[PDB]
Structures are given as C-alpha cells and as structure tokens.
Amino acid sequence: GSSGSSGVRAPVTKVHGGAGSAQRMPLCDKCGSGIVGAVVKARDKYRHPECFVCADCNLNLKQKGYFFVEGELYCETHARARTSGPSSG
C-alpha cells in the first residue's frame, strides 16, 4: 500500500503583437500567403476561404462547424472527439 497523495497545476498564457511594416493584411496560417480579396476568420486567427479545413481530414469547416483544439482546427467529428466533454465555461 502506498496511501500517498500528489498535486500539480501549471497554467498557460498567450501573447500576440507585432510592430514594423505590412500591407495591413492577415497572413494565412495555412499557406502562409498574404490574404487579399477573401478571408475566413473564426475566433482570432484567419484562414483563406479554401484553406479553412480540418487538420485530420482537411474538411472545409467554413460552412461546417469549425473547432479549436490546442490552437489547431478540427471538424465537428474529430473536434468532438478532442473536446469531448468540455468544461463549464
């Protein structure tokens, strides 16, 4: 018998900011290619109208319900598996 106890908690933080020069346009995090004309931004990130897809099946989430798991995107199917049973927020 061990009858021991443990406990650990490591929070996380994010930061975004950049100064210099640019064409005032979002950079597709998918093909890293300047976006001009038509873009698709879910929450804070931006993705082309064609690049927007799952990371496992590459399914166009544009029309479908996009998801955010660990920064990466996913379809209702895959995503659901990842965020399966989310916490009360």
Under the rule (CB under 5 A), what is the footprint of Zn ion? 28, 30-31, 48, 51, 54, 56-57, 75, 78
Sign (positive or negative) of CA dihedral 24, 30, 33, 39: negative
Shortest Å, Cβ 24 to Zn ion: 17
Residue 1 or residue 78: which is nearer to Zn ion going by CB? 78
**Burial zone of 42 (CB within 10 Å; 0-12 exposed, 13-18 middle, 19+ buried):** middle
Alpha helix positions (H), the chain: 76-82
Shortest Å, Cβ 12 to Zn ion: 24
Shortest Å, Cβ 39 to Zn ion: 9
